[PDB]
Design a protein around this ligand. Structure first.
Ligand SMILES: *[C@@H]1O[C@H](CO)[C@@H](O)[C@H](O)[C@H]1NC(C)=O
Ligand SMILES: *[C@@H]1O[C@H](CO)[C@@H](O)[C@H](O)[C@H]1NC(C)=O
Ligand SMILES: *[C@@H]1O[C@H](CO)[C@@H](O)[C@H](O)[C@H]1NC(C)=O
Ligand SMILES: *[C@@H]1O[C@H](CO)[C@@H](O)[C@H](O)[C@H]1NC(C)=O
Ligand SMILES: *[C@@H]1O[C@H](CO)[C@@H](O)[C@H](O)[C@H]1NC(C)=O
Ligand SMILES: *[C@@H]1O[C@H](CO)[C@@H](O)[C@H](O)[C@H]1NC(C)=O
Ligand SMILES: *[C@@H]1O[C@H](CO)[C@@H](O)[C@H](O)[C@H]1NC(C)=O
Ligand SMILES: *[C@@H]1O[C@H](CO)[C@@H](O)[C@H](O)[C@H]1NC(C)=O
Ligand SMILES: [Ca+2]
Lengths: 481, 481, 481, 481
């Protein structure tokens, strides 16, 4: 009668905590941010490069296509001549200027083998910090032709497709009108700004939508591999820097204050329960889950105080509309805060299973799932050993031919897709006509037919044992009377 | 011997009821209505906008594409010059005129934040009834430039993609020939009829096929979001307003009279069974299903009497062939009647399980499925809590990047597709390269490998218990003799 | 010791029967007939209609596209001017001429409703034999403008997409060169040969490949619905009429004689076993399967004697190379013989399970699968009632919008694909935004989560009962000694 | 206490063996070889053939498209004019010249049937060694018009799509510049080099990337079937011939020496264990797996010594840069070595299950999987008989229409895809509208609903029996005390 009142107290606390958190994650995701990013993407990615071409930005193939993109579709997308400054789609203001930036490697950064020194003169290693070019090159008479260090253009290390590109390099800020920017890009193409030593080219800009009040930090990364070619990549990230403007935003700030108070409450409660039991605490499952929730929530509050709410670059940009707004770090911490927020909300919803042990069937199901975690963990070890064995088989066979097996983690995720049934078997069968079939049939027969059913066998036998033990307990208590 | 005759009586009633209902749902769905809507769709949606373009109506991107559509493909589709008035595909008569209609919002309907009042002048809020513009604008000298209320153009609230658009706005009826309509559309484009304040544009028309006798109420909705862009949408809805023309339609009207008599019979029978048992009635499953069937059938008869069979607008249109036929409400109640009819037919076919308890194995299967509904309901609660937890995780992570996770219900239905195996993992892995993988692998491992098999464990143990209890009952009755 | 010798006798008979049959079905399917049909298909279907168009034959939309096809891509495909008569791909001889044929309906074959008699003048019913036009029309001065009955052009009823088109109609044989055929097709287009009354247009021709010795009977059917539009369809069917040419074909004819002797043997054996047991014969499973095999094999021998080996039209064609070879019936009986042959081979391979009851585990598995057929049949009845209930729900909801739910059998097969995981959920969710989701989630939850696992529960309990009964039998026989 | 030290000894040996092997298979697969092959593929395959065409190399249709490819896209891809010799993508050196090669068949190599000898003059059999043309033809004044035997151009038998093409034929080495090569190809097209007798055309070349130090042996095979048409095929194979250049490659050679020492150790250990037990050795499972690993590793060491490390053709090429480097055999043994390496790594990871029998639950799972292999083998026999029966049904029905059922093994792998849920049901349903549906529904109902669940039933009953036998053993040992 007192434990039920305790569960009532920590339930009427927790449901208010969950309502506050699902209000915050209704205020974060504004209702149609998706259409903003898909209109920006279908403007800059999906449009054809020129009238005489059919390549997108998504399917670039060589470096001349990249010059046609920077001269053509990018300048038709950035500079909408208003029916001054350009409003993209006649709504989205282009903040300041876009910035193009290059990352180079040194000549002779690798090593040509001995018998081929007569033919091939120059080599260029795969991109690294040790291989990076610091020398000025070309006409040397501008910022685009002189190296600039990472701590002098306020950048950060971007994690691209095939490397981790640093924030330094050879930046050139563009201009406010289409004619000045086209003249600067033609001056870069004429003096050869992208040669054999280029390994990455960033195009950074930032737009602002005043209708729904969202920034958008576009980053278009083109990676030139050492193998020759072009790997395009993009990143559209909707910031929200100016909070206080609407009544609902004051409501969200009040819910932020209330959320900080709730996390203070739960941290103090878990410390008071850890002051009693020294280590009779992590031996349960719900106290460890409360540890995970309060650690992720303290990290979320630390990100939202120390990093995201630090709009020095916004007010510093709003003193002159002719520079480049450094919205890189705000977008990076917005991504980190979205990941921490989503994982915190997921474990808060998982925490609800302390409070639906109300019925007898719910107790049977919870006891069943708690008595099979040991044996499912052991079979998860065996299953993942055989699964990573097939993943390394597939990476050694198909790692040079198939997109779905290009890196090792992509081999793992391709095998989860093959288990579910999302196959592109045509490229596997034309990549290797012998082990393609043998890999595929043995992976279907020894996972989806045999090893998949073993998790299910463990769950069957555990559930039958739990139901029979409870029924036999009650039958013994009835035949003892 | 009397209960078997009672089951025989309520079986020879019910099978005639099912034959009447499957005759009605053979007369409703005429055999090839689908090709009529796909030829109308491949005329108006899938055709390229002009000769120099490759955009459809399905893939519009900006507002100039919409003007090229209204000037180009729409007028090549509506006005087939007959080898007067235009027969679409030389079969389908274009009833009257098409109507284009605009929904606007007021200038300054939102609020520009403080530090950006110097740069950005005007804002336009997301569409609502409070934000809607009522002021006349432009040249103000026609119906296209003056607001018209919802109750004065006989419209209704359309439920579009991103809002619930009202029926009011700035309508312009077009004309009978291609030249007059092209002149009116050029007069709209020249005087700027779609500006920054437009939030929706409807294009409504209605065709009639006299060969198979079906109307078709085309509604082409273009939504201009507050973010800038174009979301196209369409709705093709085959009415059938003139019933009595063929012998089979007199047969269908006779089956409608017979169906109303059967529903009178079943309602009186359920009231006579509810007059005996006051509440020893909903404690079963088949009486509650009869309640659901007679409620849905009374609602279907009410829709077919009070709403769908109300062709005042048809006979009112047939006094002058130069106006716009308001076929909005007939199409809306035809959609409602199709949903009620389909759900009524589904629960009538589910009702058949009163009458296939004839064999002993059928009794074993029915007792098995009736003894596991409690435990499958409890595990459905636990499964749906973990499932909605993953859906909110996916909505917070991918809700700004991926089409399949744009809204919350689309996150739920995308997760059902991931469980079945209909994945587009490329866009998930390029949206977020860390939690894309972690979300996907933990959702596969903790649903398709573990929580999916628990429903199956419940069904295994319940079926084994039921078969063993019946076999042990008969063995005890054999060893008692 | 005598039953084992009997099984040895009927095993060394049967394995020779299976080797003969898998030699016949290695001789029937020649090793690369597929590339012959895909080169004919990618010549006539996948090529663009003209240089200024992008439509295939597969994606025709209107009647002017069909005239551009008959004037353009068909005459560039049929008449390869040899580097006389035309060798398609410089290998495949075009036998004789192609024949184009039209099927019409009468004016006023339906009924215009009362209030619309002032506007719409003429109607044309959906195609049937009662609706068919017999009147001569147009200039009336040729075979293309005069009706010809089915028994006077040797045709047969084609089973198209939306009707069952008869063999009669308005045929026009084309000519041997491209210029004469283009002149005849231009004379058809100028005098308007396809008007509002056309319901089907066949294009029949036949090519012969002398390298691998195969005929190919191309039939291109364009169906013009009553709704207006074009439904294209095709049929490529590789005959083989001249048998005796290679040594392997004499070997195949010897295997045909040996197969007729084996079927004589099995029919006499089953009659001798039915003369003993009057009805203690169909009470087993393998005697009924032998009945199915000998009935299908007698039907296969009857088709191969009375119908397929009847090359009167081939030798009758080889007296003049300027007519049309009636290869319709030979292609139809070749399709029927391929279906009978494939089903006979499937049940012959199923018959092999009389002879792998050799081990004790094989006896356990066979007894298990024979003791669960009754209960799986009962649950197959319940499962198919709920499955057809969902299929009729989906046909009433989506039967006017979605290709995958166009007809009722396509609804059934689309639901099997949804169970496996081959979904196009985008068109379902844009067809109906309320019952699309509700139908999809309830079909996943009440099939793939609940009713799918019940077959598995039946198989689990039956296998556990069979293994425990055999183990308990041997334990009782060991504890009785 | 001594067996645990023995397991410790053969575990600290084996984990070092696994670390050495996963270092070798990190050095083999360089981190981004995939982007090198996809840039070569998107240069030579995915580019359009000319400016006025839309065909790739992947979708060739006839022989004039192949001449437009050899004159157009191939010469725009091979000969990048450097901003001498051509650097492809300004990085990849084109080694020497490309070689085009033709395989022909004789006139009259087949047999025209009797009644058609008047019409068709010449036939050409399907390609074989007996059918191959050895006669000189055309102008006869060069290497392109005179037969050259397989042992005089150092080729080997290529295993193409529809045949096994020999290494001989009519080769023509091209030249170093685009003008000379275009002149030679125009001289081949003008004098008709590809006629009716051509059955295959190889285009072989080899590029070298000095940045990441990889060769790439491009082979473009176009197969002209006897049916007329073009089947394109390609093969991109990244060699690595010059080993010693980097510090990591010296580390890899040291790991190769260490791997040869480990395989010497394991072979001597297995021979010492086979000298004790004569045949009490293959009766276990881990000794047979060690046999498989040491046989595959001795074969891998034999391939890497006797075949792959035999760079006579490289140093022989580096004496003159104007010939053709025979990199055929090095690419073939690199493919064989990748397959042997991947399968050896897979069975090494499978060998790890000797050493995770540490816990009691792991012992339960291993005993469970070892007691069900007999019954899963018996049901795998029954399942594969029914599965190959359906595969032969599908090959006889769909083997002339559908790509996914073209050959018999493709029917098997298409059925595994149908079981997982990767269906293209549209082409099956338009190939055969009766047995397409009946085959598909009976294959879903009698595999995914019934026979799939029987493996699972075997695993359920075996796991329940094993857990109950161990629990009953411990309960009997507790009730015996
Ligand atoms: C590149 O480096 C090579 C040697 O490392 C040198 O011979 C060559 O002149 C250099 N070229 C340029 C453009 O720096
Ligand atoms: C120096 O910079 C100017 C831009 O102001 C540019 O036009 C010029 O080309 C540069 N000098 C050389 C030698 O390229
Ligand atoms: C729009 O509103 C702003 C302030 O709300 C005003 O300054 C501006 O003049 C208005 N423009 C138009 C075109 O109404
Ligand atoms: C007034 O309406 C007419 C249409 O009759 C239109 O042509 C004209 O442009 C309108 N007036 C102005 C000032 O736009
Ligand atoms: C078609 O039939 C209608 C009435 O059935 C008639 O008035 C009309 O003249 C006919 N037209 C032709 C072309 O036969
Ligand atoms: C009569 O047939 C000829 C073909 O020989 C055709 O050219 C002509 O057009 C036909 N007559 C009429 C009046 O169309
Ligand atoms: C091909 O062979 C046939 C008979 O086999 C012969 O009549 C014909 O002249 C030959 N043609 C050529 C070009 O060799
Ligand atoms: C002989 O070879 C030359 C190439 O040097 C070629 O141009 C010529 O066409 C050949 N002779 C004949 C008769 O084709
Ligand atoms: Ca699946």
């Amino acid at each position: 009668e007192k434990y039920l009142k305790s569960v009532l107290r920590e339930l009427v606390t927790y449901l208010l905590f969950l309502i506050v958190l699902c209000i915050l994650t209704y205020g974060m995701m504004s209702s149609n941010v998706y259409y903003y990013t898909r209109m920006m993407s279908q403007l800059f990615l999906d449009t054809p490069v020129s009238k005489t071409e059919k390549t997108n930005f998504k399917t670039l193939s060589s470096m001349e296509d990249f010059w046609k993109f920077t001269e053509g579709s990018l300048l038709d997308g950035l500079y909408w001549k208003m029916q001054n400054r350009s409003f993209i789609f006649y709504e989205n203001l282009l903040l300041g200027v876009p910035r193009i930036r290059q990352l180079r490697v040194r000549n002779g950064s690798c090593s040509i083998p001995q018998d081929l020194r007569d033919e091939i003169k120059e080599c260029y290693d795969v991109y690294s910090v040790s291989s990076e070019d610091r020398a000025p090159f070309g006409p040397r008479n501008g910022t685009a032709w002189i190296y600039t260090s990472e701590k002098d253009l306020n950048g950060s290390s971007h994690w691209g497709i095939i490397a981790t590109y640093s924030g330094a390099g050879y930046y050139l800020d563009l201009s406010r009108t289409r004619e000045e920017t086209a003249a600067q890009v033609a001056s870069l193409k004429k003096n050869v700004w992208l040669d054999r030593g280029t390994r990455a080219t960033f195009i950074d800009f930032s737009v602002y939508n005043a209708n729904i009040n969202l920034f958008c930090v576009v980053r278009l990364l083109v990676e030139f591999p050492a193998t020759g070619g072009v790997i395009p990549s993009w990143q559209f990230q909707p910031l929200k820097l100016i909070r206080y403007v609407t009544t609902f935003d004051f409501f969200l700030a009040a819910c932020e204050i209330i959320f900080c108070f709730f996390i203070f409450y739960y941290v103090v409660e878990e410390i008071l329960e850890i002051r009693i039991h020294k280590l009779h605490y992590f031996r349960s499952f719900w106290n460890c889950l409360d540890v995970v929730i309060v650690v992720l929530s303290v990290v979320a509050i630390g990100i939202n105080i120390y990093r995201t709410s630090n709009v020095e670059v916004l007010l510093q940009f709003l003193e002159d509309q002719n520079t480049f707004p450094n919205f890189e770090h705000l977008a990076y911490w917005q991504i980190q805060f979205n990941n921490i927020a989503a994982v915190t909300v997921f474990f808060v919803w998982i925490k609800l299973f302390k409070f639906i042990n109300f019925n007898r069937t719910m107790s049977q199901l919870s006891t069943t799932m708690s008595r099979c975690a040991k044996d499912l963990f052991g079979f998860a070890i065996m299953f993942f050993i055989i699964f990573l064995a097939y993943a390394q088989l597939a990476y050694l066979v198909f790692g040079t031919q198939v997109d779905d097996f290009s890196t090792f983690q992509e081999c793992i995720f391709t095998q989860f897709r093959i288990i579910l049934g999302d196959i592109n078997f045509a490229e596997i069968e034309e990549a290797n006509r012998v082990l393609g079939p043998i890999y595929f049939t043995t992976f279907v027969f020894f996972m989806f037919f045999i090893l998949l059913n073993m998790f299910l066998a463990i769950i069957n036998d555990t559930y039958s044992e739990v139901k029979s033990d409870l029924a036999q307990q009650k039958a013994e208590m009835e035949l003892s009377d």
